[PDB]
Design a protein around this ligand. Sequence first.
Ligand SMILES: O=C1O[C@@H](CC2CCCCC2)Cc2cc(O)cc(O)c21
Ligand SMILES: O=C1O[C@@H](CC2CCCCC2)Cc2cc(O)cc(O)c21
Ligand SMILES: N[C@@H](CCCC[NH3+])C(=O)O
Ligand SMILES: N[C@@H](CCCC[NH3+])C(=O)O
Lengths: 506, 503
Amino acid sequence: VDPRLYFENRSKFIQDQKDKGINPYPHKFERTISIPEFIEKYKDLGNGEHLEDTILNITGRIMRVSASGQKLRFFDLVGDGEKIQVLANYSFHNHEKGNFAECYDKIRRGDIVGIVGFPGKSKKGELSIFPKETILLSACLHMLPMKYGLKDTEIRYRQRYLDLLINESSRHTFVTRTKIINFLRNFLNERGFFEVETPMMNLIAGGANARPFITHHNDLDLDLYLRIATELPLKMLIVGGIDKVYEIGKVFRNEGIDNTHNPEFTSCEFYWAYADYNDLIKWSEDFFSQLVYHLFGTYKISYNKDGPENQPIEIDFTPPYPKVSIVEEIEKVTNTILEQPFDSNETIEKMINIIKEHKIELPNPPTAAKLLDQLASHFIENKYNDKPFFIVEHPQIMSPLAKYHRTKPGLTERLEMFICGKEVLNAYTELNDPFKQKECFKLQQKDREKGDTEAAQLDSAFCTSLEYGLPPTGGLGLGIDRITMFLTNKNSIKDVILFPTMRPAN
Amino acid sequence: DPRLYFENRSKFIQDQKDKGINPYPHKFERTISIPEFIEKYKDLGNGEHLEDTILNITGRIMRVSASGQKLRFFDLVGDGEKIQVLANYSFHNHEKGNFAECYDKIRRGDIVGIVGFPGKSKKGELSIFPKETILLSACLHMLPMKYGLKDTEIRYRQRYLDLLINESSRHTFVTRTKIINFLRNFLNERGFFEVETPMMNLIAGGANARPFITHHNDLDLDLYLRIATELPLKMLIVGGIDKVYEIGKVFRNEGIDNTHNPEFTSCEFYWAYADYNDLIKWSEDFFSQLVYHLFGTYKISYNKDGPENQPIEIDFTPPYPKVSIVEEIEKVTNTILEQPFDSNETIEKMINIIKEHKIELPNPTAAKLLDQLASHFIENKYNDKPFFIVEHPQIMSPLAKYHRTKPGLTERLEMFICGKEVLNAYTELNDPFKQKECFKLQQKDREKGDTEAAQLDSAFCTSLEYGLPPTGGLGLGIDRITMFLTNKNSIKDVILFPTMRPA
Ligand SMILES: O=C1O[C@@H](CC2CCCCC2)Cc2cc(O)cc(O)c21
Ligand SMILES: O=C1O[C@@H](CC2CCCCC2)Cc2cc(O)cc(O)c21
Ligand SMILES: N[C@@H](CCCC[NH3+])C(=O)O
Ligand SMILES: N[C@@H](CCCC[NH3+])C(=O)O
């Protein structure tokens, strides 16, 4: 009933041990077997069968406490996601080491224990460790929460260690997460790609449309920005001759937090010399179809799109995926023509009016790209939940770094894969002409002058590298935390990050 | 003069745009790479042409030469390998353009798309014989030669130029990536689990270092970049992930030199039920197996005093020497450092030792004092082999478990190559009551003006109360390890883009 008193009592227990000799936090307990190795080694065992001649050293944490009297104690020992029962029988206690009840009366739920004992099955067939001696390695001073206590509470986030022990689903989630990354690292390695590291602190934060973080180095007396993307120095490396290059790492964007946006998230971006939009389309279908089959043995997975209570939709990752041109589909759904230039007063007022007619949010500032972006967000982004699908060939006012379309004026060779209306992949044929790049950086600075503080600044060091000749390349970005959300059936980005960014408890 | 060169090539590109031809074509389908090309056709004798194999080649032209008007030669470099291109007036497809006009425009550094056949020259240099050559992306500047990158900062700002000219820089970052590749699989074979902890936190803990500050606007919240991955990894051990690690960047806001870049790559792992001794063997196993994986031997050549002096042989054969820090300082300085080490007297004693040896007084707490004594009297004891500094005082190690038999010390180890700290490990402190004792001690030395004194994480202290099992944790400095395995005397030579001033 009273956790504050429970913790105050256990604190006295630890100090009462030190006064009366014992050390409650010993340095080393040489373990002999792990609990998973234990279950494998002795699961194929008969009912009631003991092997009291094989003595083993095993560790773990107590998570269930019960007793069938003063002479038989029952526990649940967990370790590495698995579990065995501890069957402490008074007959098998090494009495030279201490009194049976005095030893086990101290055990509480959460205690980390070292056990010397032998393996066997119970009468009912429960595979158990049968201790000869049990020594406390690291006591748990607090009361562990119940599964109910964490269900719709933020303790999973602020106290992830509780979530990792109590909920089996949590360990499963993050084991899947690093399997997603393990797949992608080798998927690129087996294809001749070269993993690198580009700085996260920069004089200018380019590569995306987002407000950055700013820090300060004292000894240099220099203001550095946290990277919002890895796009530019990776393209500088293609110039350097590394024709197959990529990076898996954290990027930082100082903007709103919600179920799809954590301030720091993991991205992967690879750059592929002598590849284009089509290769990036085929790559995205190849990788996602194989990523999903690698984890599930199927191409169709089910996802609770509307939360856990409501029924799930089924997502079919089987290639090929639908391709939807952003301008012409917005055209069709709205029955209008977006005349070019898309950034003209006529086309901007037009889009303002169709945003106003449908009572959709007006973006501030009403830049032409944000109008198009909200139009695409409100009209084409949730077109398919049955499968992933590509929104392609964005106008050049939206894609300052994408190469212009080879047969469609004003558009780019850009693609974007969505799952359940959530952007998960960004790719395009790279804009490799320094003459046309400055015009998209100087037009972005004027967009910056209108209050669009996401409008990309002028990186000069990157512009100079374009002047030594960037070969025709194709680059693609992956939002890893979002891929993990869908592939682990979680509705929040806080559920696929170990320690998400939270409002402080003060 | 370069300025005129860039402007001619700049005007040259605009001429092509007005003249009709696209100077930056969208797509050239390559059939074969330059590495595959050498592998596929290395064995051809001097003079043979397979005129039937019409191939599509890519690369960067890095040499221009001619023999009259009908013969043109270039060096096509790609993926670190180089082949010849022999353009001859007979094989040229005259339907696509004039021979001389097509090839007079190609200059050193240009990205081209060649369609031709494989063959070896009369002198026997493996060549590609184009029927048609297309400029895919032009080099507008003048690329320097190898000497243009010697006495300059250019390698660090324009790493792409260094990678394109100095063939050794490409070897170093391949080695850097192979180092990390080996370490990840070394841990993964032993059941370790890779995670990613926050880089922005309410508190910067896990090391004795001053952090960077930043601000998240929507939350109106100041956040510190992580100086270590230590504390959030240990709370994951509490969560039941007994073999956890993270290979990533950490940020420390201090001075820059040849072994300090404000952001650097570390690897920390945490191994429950292991100890000071298990980590000692892990370090010896890993560094011996890593060296052998790279070099086929346990002995390395490293120019400790630069390429202008004779190098030394680093023998990574295990085991490595272990040296106690307080014991050795006391022997080498012929003094007695008494406990408490942060007592006024032995603080005054260490200060006087530094004074009569004429060493610089650290901005003078006992832990900073001890660190200075170790740096000048211990840390260069062994250069021919890596060695461990062990059993540090707890005054220095607030997160390390106290030594089980040596009072005042901890079960800590630091490994050094050529006097550079490259590894840090100890038996983790898991008694939460001793932890807050050590964190409150850091605040007293923080009150004396220590920017690098650890502030207490209340989240982390609460974590140990739920029970942190006996654990041994270790930390690697990836960049510094990369330096010694690539024979580099600066950390900037192993970081693709080191932190530097604006141009
Ligand atoms: O995860 C995210 O996805 C990216 C979008 C992602 C699409 C694929 C290419 C890389 C970028 C956008 C974003 C913003 C933010 O402030 C926080 C976040 O977690 C994310
Ligand atoms: O390279 C470095 O190594 C680490 C020391 C290294 C020892 C082994 C464990 C990981 C940390 C110290 C350091 C500080 C700094 O501000 C910039 C830097 O580049 C380095
Ligand atoms: N850096 C991009 C991803 C790669 C786009 C294609 N080069 C982004 O932030 O979305
Ligand atoms: N975080 C430590 C490395 C790990 C030490 C053992 N937990 C450091 O910065 O040196």
